[PDB]
Amino acid sequence: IVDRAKMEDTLKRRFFYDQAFAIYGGVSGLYDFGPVGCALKNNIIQTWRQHFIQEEQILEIDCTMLTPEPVLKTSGHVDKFADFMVKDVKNGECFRADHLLKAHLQKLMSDKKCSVEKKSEMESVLAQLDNYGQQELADLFVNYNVKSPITGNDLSPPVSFNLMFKTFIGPGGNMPGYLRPETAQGIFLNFKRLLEFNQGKLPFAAAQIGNSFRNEISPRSGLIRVREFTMAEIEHFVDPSEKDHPKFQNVADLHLYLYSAKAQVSGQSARKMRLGDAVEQGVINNTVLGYFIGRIYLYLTKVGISPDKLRFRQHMENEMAHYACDCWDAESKTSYGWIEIVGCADRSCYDLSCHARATKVPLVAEKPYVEEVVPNVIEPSFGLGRIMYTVFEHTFHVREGDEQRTFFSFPAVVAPFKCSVLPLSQNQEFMPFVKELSEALTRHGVSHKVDDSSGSIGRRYARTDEIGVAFGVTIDFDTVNKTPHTATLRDRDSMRQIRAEISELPSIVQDLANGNITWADVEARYPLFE
Amino acid sequence: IVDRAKMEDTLKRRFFYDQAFAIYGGVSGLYDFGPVGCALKNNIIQTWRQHFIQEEQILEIDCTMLTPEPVLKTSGHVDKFADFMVKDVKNGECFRADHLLKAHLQKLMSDKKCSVEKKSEMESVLAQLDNYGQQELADLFVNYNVKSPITGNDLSPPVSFNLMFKTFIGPGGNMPGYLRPETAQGIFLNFKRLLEFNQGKLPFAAAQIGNSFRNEISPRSGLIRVREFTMAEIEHFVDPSEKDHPKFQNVADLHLYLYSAKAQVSGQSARKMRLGDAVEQGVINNTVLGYFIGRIYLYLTKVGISPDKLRFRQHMENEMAHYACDCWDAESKTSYGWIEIVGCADRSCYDLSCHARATKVPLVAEKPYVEEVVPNVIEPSFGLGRIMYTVFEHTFHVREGDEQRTFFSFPAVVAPFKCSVLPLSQNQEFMPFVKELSEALTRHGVSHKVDDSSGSIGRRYARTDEIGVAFGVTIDFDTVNKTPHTATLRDRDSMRQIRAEISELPSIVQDLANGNITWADVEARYPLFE
Ligand SMILES: Nc1ncnc2c1ncn2[C@@H]1O[C@@H](COP(=O)(O)OP(=O)(O)OP(=O)(O)O)[C@H](O)[C@H]1O
Ligand SMILES: Nc1ncnc2c1ncn2[C@@H]1O[C@@H](COP(=O)(O)OP(=O)(O)OP(=O)(O)O)[C@H](O)[C@H]1O
């Protein structure tokens, strides 16, 4: 139960992100990222690269964002990629029917005058919103008589709204284009060149880390709903008859919350199963999908997401994407309820085929005389924007001190900079120490910054914790005058300190950040400091 | 004099880049980058970060690409950001007048029937093309009677063509938007928040590394002219009365080719002056601009650009950008002649003012009672796309061998991967060595890859050189059987080899790549290997 308000204030004050074109009134769905935001955003992407691209030796390509209409028409986006929109007959004001109806029912279930018999009924409606097609939503909008949230006017019937941005490539109108709503397509149009890289055998995964555009109808979720964001997508091309992953046993012992399609249609809750048992009992189709669900869980967890607030929900029969036949979304529980931050879909083979036909260009591989096959693809899609935000709410805390200080418990691999070196005097008495410590840290690969801000050592850290800095080393006079020269090591979360020689701290902070040593261990080997 | 044709073939075969939406016929100005392309593209950006952001402790932000019309209207892009376009009256076919006229004169100067008196005259015309405004170009198009390049029909008079892409943010048309043709604007709209970071003092530089869009009229220069590219821009906010840079003495002894505005209007050539002498003789206005010109020269040179093919040309009076009052472009001589790859402009203070007014939001700083001032900004703009391409032509070579093999002499800091470990047998006899070498290299921070391709050791490298791999270590039977165990170190460019213990090579390759040791030194300490 995080206090969004108080948090958003800290994220904007320290400038993690903020409204884009603020001095012009701003634009919904558009935000800019400040220094700290970029540092944290870059750490997440780098962590992702090591976790997937590096770990699975994935190929990398960087395709264009502009796309000629024909390409997206063949993919089915020009037809099925949209959201149901509604608007009051009085003025323009557009709203995403899907969500509005969801916010309306929550208002009715909240009202005490609501009977248990109804509150229950409405729950069955919400837990099946992504299914209700064109007509079905129209009925609910009439049954519950939904009306504009503000100055409640009459709402027009629900209609489709293509979420792709429109443009024109080159002078004239002969070539109408769009801004890619996803990156996947780019990888498909380059399947042959990519297939050639792996000698021609399967499986093999291609990846992309670029920006995608979504002309979202009415964004009101901060960074959760933007019309422009960076997403990392992997296209795991596997043979339809070989949907088995060799490394699955690496994540078979993971206990994570699964919310199958059945559990949703049978009105029951999500179960916390073992990834292996899940694949066994037929819950999770194959092991390829299961391996990725594990890799995903691990990544999100390693970045800072809370396990007790993370679950994988399976799509419904008619909730499926136009290009999918099965999918599982990694949802994180936030102040906006459960929201998908990573979509692991199973586009059986809808893409290579469509493009193959439309262009009469064959896109297949061969196996052992020899047979050709159309590669089935499992696509783990990461929304680096939502993942970062979820980290904010899952690590944001308010110190128990009356000063109402806040801080983020960012893991050591995502925090802006691991250590914060802050000395009392910046004269030539401490420089000999600050200098060596700063370089000793660098040799250990520990990102840091020397503090110069004004205020007491206690306030000096209050600002460091605010942006989530993992550790801190205080160099006082006793560090300079006394001998051996010892400095103070401070832990962000607990605020507890330690006193050790200023020459051993480097390797220590390195193990604390690398996860080789526990803060408990530190308090066990070295003398405590109040 | 590089053979573009042969080169483009190698760049596409190894998949550095290629036509985007190829199976759909492709689109001019749009290209995708393959694995090697991405590796090299990422090395350049990383090298840039260390050279500028890290070296000058520049602040970093990441703004949106979508921009609401009002913002670009206030910047003057909706009015002056365009290119003169012409088209034959027969069909659509659009052409950039600016260039077409330039290609026409070159055809006339090439023809032997052309007299010296005329060839000279035309040169004076080309060396002043970016000046000729609306009317002036119309005359030349009539005087030289320019006509469509293909099936030469009659060309319509030259007219302006806004290069920005058009779109609509959100449902409806109440909010018309554009795709940022540059990043600078984003940094200006966030001036206050950024100014606050530096306590409020000047100077201070903000930066951005994102994509920009340019609806280029008719792109025919491969990667030189794209409608989508990644650009790194720095906004050095300095006080108008303090246009002096403290570090200038770090690049004062640089001898680079300068092509002042005068030299262009006085029909004379470019001089190779000393950066310091240039600022003295009033050539280069201030030292702030001079420091950056040096930093730029160093970066481009460090990346792989040839000094004898690099020059800094100063803009003409009416060639100035709508937001500039003075500028210098770093031009590289390529198969397309001199092209700007880095634009270092001096937008005196045109931006902060425009936005300040239009929104009635004050954007200024203060100095020592105290006075407020409108920061003058020097904007070094890097087109990471053109810089990479220039590196291709300036490092592409054809082995003297009849097999017509090619290779790129990529510096160690940009090559896909510094070293290439290739063993003869991949059995369990060499693994103990390949393993240790691979890890020893990693501990030294040397990017590498174990070769598995088929063919003789000589052909194994022919493919490694093709993508520009700096070095290579061959592990043969003598490395396994003999003792001490020695491997062969091979230099890409010279193809010359060395024989040293397989345990010392790691540190050696590290110094060769880091530039601590010369290949000559290696041949001086260790025994040569034929
Ligand atoms: N507007 C957005 N802002 C930020 N990230 C987004 C946005 N829309 C989608 N994503 C990211 O892309 C999603 C994967 O693609 P997907 O097509 O499943 O989105 P989606 O199903 O349409 O989600 P939504 O129900 O929120 O519209 C990631 O789960 C999510 O982080
Ligand atoms: N179409 C393009 N493709 C790749 N890079 C580009 C393109 N257009 C501009 N750039 C990059 O941005 C330039 C800086 O901005 P600038 O406004 O000076 O471009 P420009 O003066 O319009 O150049 P041009 O004469 O080629 O149109 C860098 O010098 C160049 O690398």
Side-chain angles (χ1 to χ4, degrees):
Chain A
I1 312 77
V2 64
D3 179 46
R4 188 193 308 174
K6 191 177 182 63
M7 180 185 87
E8 305 190 311
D9 286 56
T10 300
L11 293 174
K12 297 181 178 182
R13 183 158 47 65
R14 299 310 297 281
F15 197 23
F16 274 104
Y17 74 98
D18 202 0
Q19 290 184 60
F21 317 104
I23 67 179
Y24 279 73
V27 179
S28 52
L30 294 176
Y31 304 77
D32 302 312
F33 297 77
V36 280
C38 291
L40 170 55
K41 186 162 62 64
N42 298 325
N43 280 175
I44 283 180
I45 305 183
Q46 210 56 52
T47 300
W48 188 85
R49 282 175 170 287
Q50 284 298 296
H51 203 83
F52 296 81
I53 294 180
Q54 192 59 52
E55 185 65 59
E56 319 298 354
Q57 293 297 298
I58 304 174
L59 297 174
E60 177 183 1
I61 67 168
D62 187 56
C63 302
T64 64
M65 294 175 273
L66 292 167
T67 297
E69 181 168 57
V71 179
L72 291 172
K73 175 61 179 181
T74 303
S75 61
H77 283 67
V78 183
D79 289 351
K80 303 74 179 180
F81 188 69
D83 275 355
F84 289 130
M85 176 179 85
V86 298
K87 50 185 179 181
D88 64 301
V89 191
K90 303 298 294 182
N91 61 186
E93 275 303 297
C94 303
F95 301 111
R96 173 173 172 171
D98 185 61
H99 296 174
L100 206 178
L101 183 285
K102 182 173 177 296
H104 186 67
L105 302 183
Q106 293 177 176
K107 229 67 63 182
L108 300 178
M109 293 179 275
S110 178
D111 173 51
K112 297 305 305 302
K113 299 177 296 182
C114 184
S115 65
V116 295
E117 302 180 1
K118 185 177 184 57
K119 183 178 181 180
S120 180
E121 165 185 291
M122 294 185 269
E123 294 181 0
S124 303
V125 182
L126 292 182
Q128 213 140 180
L129 237 179
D130 302 300
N131 294 56
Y132 302 158
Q134 168 58 63
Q135 188 57 59
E136 293 185 295
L137 279 182
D139 301 311
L140 298 178
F141 262 96
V142 181
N143 294 180
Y144 293 77
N145 189 62
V146 181
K147 303 175 68 294
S148 178
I150 24 64
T151 186
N153 316 69
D154 256 57
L155 247 52
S156 62
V159 301
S160 298
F161 177 68
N162 206 300
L163 296 167
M164 302 191 281
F165 283 99
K166 222 300 180 303
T167 326
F168 290 83
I169 305 175
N174 5 54
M175 191 188 301
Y178 296 115
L179 293 185
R180 69 178 183 185
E182 58 168 50
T183 71
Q185 297 313 309
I187 294 179
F188 301 132
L189 301 180
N190 291 301
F191 177 66
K192 278 302 180 64
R193 316 171 192 176
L194 293 176
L195 174 59
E196 174 176 351
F197 268 66
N198 202 302
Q199 311 299 57
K201 278 72 68 58
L202 284 57
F204 81 83
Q208 251 195 298
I209 300 185
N211 301 293
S212 294
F213 304 66
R214 310 272 266 247
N215 184 55
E216 230 64 53
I217 303 173
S218 187
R220 299 184 179 183
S221 303
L223 288 180
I224 295 303
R225 274 234 135 57
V226 295
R227 293 167 170 166
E228 186 187 307
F229 56 105
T230 291
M231 71 187 307
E233 301 188 299
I234 302 176
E235 304 307 305
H236 189 286
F237 293 104
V238 66
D239 181 291
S241 67
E242 303 295 61
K243 277 189 169 59
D244 232 60
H245 199 300
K247 301 181 181 182
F248 181 75
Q249 214 58 54
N250 295 176
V251 298
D253 281 300
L254 292 179
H255 297 302
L256 40 67
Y257 296 66
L258 298 170
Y259 196 43
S260 62
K262 293 176 59 183
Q264 300 175 61
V265 184
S266 63
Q268 57 179 302
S269 299
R271 303 166 51 193
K272 180 181 179 181
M273 306 169 76
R274 168 176 169 291
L275 228 182
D277 292 52
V279 185
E280 285 290 303
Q281 299 166 55
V283 182
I284 295 178
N285 195 169
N286 58 63
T287 48
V288 173
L289 190 67
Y291 177 60
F292 281 136
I293 292 180
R295 284 271 79 192
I296 290 178
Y297 174 71
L298 295 176
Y299 175 68
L300 297 174
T301 301
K302 177 159 59 181
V303 174
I305 309 297
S306 298
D308 59 302
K309 307 170 188 173
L310 174 59
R311 76 178 182 181
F312 292 72
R313 185 182 73 70
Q314 175 173 54
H315 283 188
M316 312 267 251
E317 187 174 61
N318 53 181
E319 166 182 48
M320 220 83 267
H322 68 281
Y323 49 62
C325 73
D326 180 52
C327 173
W328 287 73
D329 290 355
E331 308 184 309
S332 57
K333 221 283 281 300
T334 63
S335 64
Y336 301 82
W338 296 92
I339 59 181
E340 105 175 64
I341 56 181
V342 185
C344 194
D346 184 304
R347 29 180 82 192
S348 47
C349 58
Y350 176 108
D351 300 289
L352 284 301
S353 305
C354 297
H355 289 296
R357 294 183 297 167
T359 63
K360 288 188 177 62
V361 178
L363 302 177
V364 298
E366 302 185 310
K367 57 182 297 179
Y369 265 110
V370 300
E371 176 193 302
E372 85 170 7
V373 300
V374 183
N376 285 47
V377 55
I378 284 62
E379 187 212 18
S381 187
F382 301 69
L384 303 181
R386 299 190 180 181
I387 294 177
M388 190 192 308
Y389 181 72
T390 305
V391 174
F392 290 145
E393 290 196 4
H394 290 183
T395 58
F396 176 83
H397 299 297
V398 179
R399 320 242 74 159
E400 208 164 1
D402 287 59
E403 191 171 303
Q404 289 294 59
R405 295 180 177 181
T406 58
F407 68 109
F408 290 85
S409 53
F410 290 158
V413 294
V414 299
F417 52 85
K418 306 190 190 64
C419 193
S420 175
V421 182
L422 80 78
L424 291 64
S425 178
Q426 196 68 63
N427 63 181
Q428 307 188 307
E429 298 295 302
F430 296 61
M431 286 308 285
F433 300 72
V434 179
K435 173 192 176 184
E436 179 56 6
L437 178 59
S438 175
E439 297 175 359
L441 292 174
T442 298
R443 295 195 299 291
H444 290 303
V446 183
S447 56
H448 61 292
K449 288 187 173 182
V450 182
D451 189 359
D452 297 303
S453 63
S454 60
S456 59
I457 168 182
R459 177 192 173 187
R460 298 273 289 295
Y461 278 123
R463 248 170 296 183
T464 259
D465 304 309
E466 192 167 54
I467 56 172
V469 182
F471 306 106
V473 178
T474 305
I475 301 181
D476 49 53
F477 304 79
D478 294 59
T479 304
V480 182
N481 300 306
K482 259 67 180 303
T483 177
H485 302 283
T486 66
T488 299
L489 178 60
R490 175 175 176 294
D491 179 294
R492 175 199 58 199
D493 301 305
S494 60
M495 298 186 101
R496 310 180 72 182
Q497 297 175 296
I498 263 295
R499 192 71 178 186
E501 195 185 310
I502 194 173
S503 72
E504 293 173 58
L505 293 176
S507 65
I508 299 176
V509 175
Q510 179 183 60
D511 291 309
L512 283 173
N514 296 173
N516 298 173
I517 268 65
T518 303
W519 177 245
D521 297 6
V522 177
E523 289 186 355
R525 301 167 182 52
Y526 310 73
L528 313 179
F529 185 72
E530 188 65 64
Chain B
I1 312 77
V2 64
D3 179 46
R4 188 193 308 174
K6 191 177 182 63
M7 180 185 87
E8 305 190 311
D9 286 56
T10 300
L11 293 174
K12 297 181 178 182
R13 183 158 47 65
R14 299 310 297 281
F15 197 23
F16 274 104
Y17 74 98
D18 202 0
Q19 290 184 60
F21 317 104
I23 67 179
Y24 279 73
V27 179
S28 52
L30 294 176
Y31 304 77
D32 302 312
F33 297 77
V36 280
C38 291
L40 170 55
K41 186 162 62 64
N42 298 325
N43 280 175
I44 283 180
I45 305 183
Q46 210 56 52
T47 300
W48 188 85
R49 282 175 170 287
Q50 284 298 296
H51 203 83
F52 296 81
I53 294 180
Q54 192 59 52
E55 185 65 59
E56 319 298 354
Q57 293 297 298
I58 304 174
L59 297 174
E60 177 183 1
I61 67 168
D62 187 56
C63 302
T64 64
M65 294 175 273
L66 292 167
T67 297
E69 181 168 57
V71 179
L72 291 172
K73 175 61 179 181
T74 303
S75 61
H77 283 67
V78 183
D79 289 351
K80 303 74 179 180
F81 188 69
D83 275 355
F84 289 131
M85 176 179 85
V86 298
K87 50 185 179 181
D88 64 301
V89 191
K90 303 298 294 182
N91 61 186
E93 275 303 297
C94 303
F95 301 111
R96 173 173 172 171
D98 185 61
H99 296 174
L100 206 178
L101 183 285
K102 182 173 177 296
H104 186 67
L105 302 183
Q106 293 177 176
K107 229 67 63 182
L108 300 178
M109 293 179 275
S110 178
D111 173 51
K112 297 305 305 302
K113 299 177 296 182
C114 184
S115 65
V116 295
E117 302 180 1
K118 185 177 184 57
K119 183 178 181 180
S120 180
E121 165 185 291
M122 294 185 269
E123 294 181 0
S124 303
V125 182
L126 292 182
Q128 213 140 180
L129 237 179
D130 302 300
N131 294 56
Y132 302 158
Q134 168 58 63
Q135 188 57 59
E136 293 185 295
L137 279 182
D139 301 311
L140 298 178
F141 262 96
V142 181
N143 294 180
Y144 293 77
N145 189 62
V146 181
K147 303 175 68 294
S148 178
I150 24 64
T151 186
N153 316 69
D154 256 57
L155 247 52
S156 62
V159 301
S160 298
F161 177 68
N162 206 300
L163 296 167
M164 302 191 281
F165 283 99
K166 222 300 180 303
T167 326
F168 290 83
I169 305 175
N174 5 54
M175 191 188 301
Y178 296 115
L179 293 185
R180 69 178 183 185
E182 58 168 50
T183 71
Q185 297 313 309
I187 294 179
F188 301 132
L189 301 180
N190 291 301
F191 177 66
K192 278 302 180 64
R193 316 171 192 176
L194 293 176
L195 174 59
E196 174 176 351
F197 268 66
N198 202 302
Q199 311 299 57
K201 278 72 68 58
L202 284 57
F204 81 83
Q208 251 195 298
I209 300 185
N211 301 293
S212 294
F213 304 66
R214 310 272 266 247
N215 184 55
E216 230 64 53
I217 303 173
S218 187
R220 299 184 179 183
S221 303
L223 288 180
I224 295 303
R225 274 234 135 57
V226 295
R227 293 167 170 166
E228 186 187 307
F229 56 105
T230 291
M231 71 187 307
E233 301 188 299
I234 302 176
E235 304 307 305
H236 189 286
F237 293 104
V238 66
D239 181 291
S241 67
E242 303 295 61
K243 277 189 169 59
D244 232 60
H245 199 300
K247 301 181 181 182
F248 181 75
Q249 214 58 54
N250 295 176
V251 298
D253 281 300
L254 292 179
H255 297 302
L256 40 67
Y257 296 66
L258 298 170
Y259 196 43
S260 62
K262 293 176 59 183
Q264 300 175 61
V265 184
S266 63
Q268 57 179 302
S269 299
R271 303 166 51 193
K272 180 181 179 181
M273 306 169 76
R274 168 176 169 291
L275 228 182
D277 292 52
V279 185
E280 285 290 303
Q281 299 166 55
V283 182
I284 295 178
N285 195 169
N286 58 63
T287 48
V288 173
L289 190 67
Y291 177 60
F292 281 136
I293 292 180
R295 284 271 79 192
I296 290 178
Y297 174 71
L298 295 176
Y299 175 68
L300 297 174
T301 301
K302 177 159 59 181
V303 174
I305 309 297
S306 298
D308 59 302
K309 307 170 188 173
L310 174 59
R311 76 178 182 181
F312 292 72
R313 185 182 73 70
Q314 175 173 54
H315 283 188
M316 312 267 251
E317 187 174 61
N318 53 181
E319 166 182 48
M320 220 83 267
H322 68 281
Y323 49 62
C325 73
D326 180 52
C327 173
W328 287 73
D329 290 355
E331 308 184 309
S332 57
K333 221 283 281 300
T334 63
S335 64
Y336 301 82
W338 296 92
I339 59 181
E340 105 175 64
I341 56 181
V342 185
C344 194
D346 184 304
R347 29 180 82 192
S348 47
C349 58
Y350 176 108
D351 300 289
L352 284 301
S353 305
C354 297
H355 289 296
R357 294 183 297 167
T359 63
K360 288 188 177 62
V361 178
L363 302 177
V364 298
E366 302 185 310
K367 57 182 297 179
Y369 265 110
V370 300
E371 176 193 302
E372 85 170 7
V373 300
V374 183
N376 285 47
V377 55
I378 284 62
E379 187 212 18
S381 187
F382 301 69
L384 303 181
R386 299 190 180 181
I387 294 177
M388 190 192 308
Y389 181 72
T390 305
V391 174
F392 290 145
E393 290 196 4
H394 290 183
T395 58
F396 176 83
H397 299 297
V398 179
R399 320 242 74 159
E400 208 164 1
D402 287 59
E403 191 171 303
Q404 289 294 59
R405 295 180 177 181
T406 58
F407 68 109
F408 290 85
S409 53
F410 290 158
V413 294
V414 299
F417 52 85
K418 306 190 190 64
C419 193
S420 175
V421 182
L422 80 78
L424 291 64
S425 178
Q426 196 68 63
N427 63 181
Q428 307 188 307
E429 298 295 302
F430 296 61
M431 286 308 285
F433 300 72
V434 179
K435 173 192 176 184
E436 179 56 6
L437 178 59
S438 175
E439 297 175 359
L441 292 174
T442 298
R443 295 195 299 291
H444 290 303
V446 183
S447 56
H448 61 292
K449 288 187 173 182
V450 182
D451 189 359
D452 297 303
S453 63
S454 60
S456 59
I457 168 182
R459 177 192 173 187
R460 298 273 289 295
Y461 278 123
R463 248 170 296 183
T464 259
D465 304 309
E466 192 167 54
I467 56 172
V469 182
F471 306 106
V473 178
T474 305
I475 301 181
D476 49 53
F477 304 79
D478 294 59
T479 304
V480 182
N481 300 306
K482 259 67 180 303
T483 177
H485 302 283
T486 66
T488 299
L489 178 60
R490 175 175 176 294
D491 179 294
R492 175 199 58 199
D493 301 305
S494 60
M495 298 186 101
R496 310 180 72 182
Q497 297 175 296
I498 263 295
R499 192 71 178 186
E501 195 185 310
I502 194 173
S503 72
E504 293 173 58
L505 293 176
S507 65
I508 299 176
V509 175
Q510 179 183 60
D511 291 309
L512 283 173
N514 296 173
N516 298 173
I517 268 65
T518 303
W519 177 245
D521 297 6
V522 177
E523 289 186 355
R525 301 167 182 52
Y526 310 73
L528 313 179
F529 185 72
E530 188 65 64

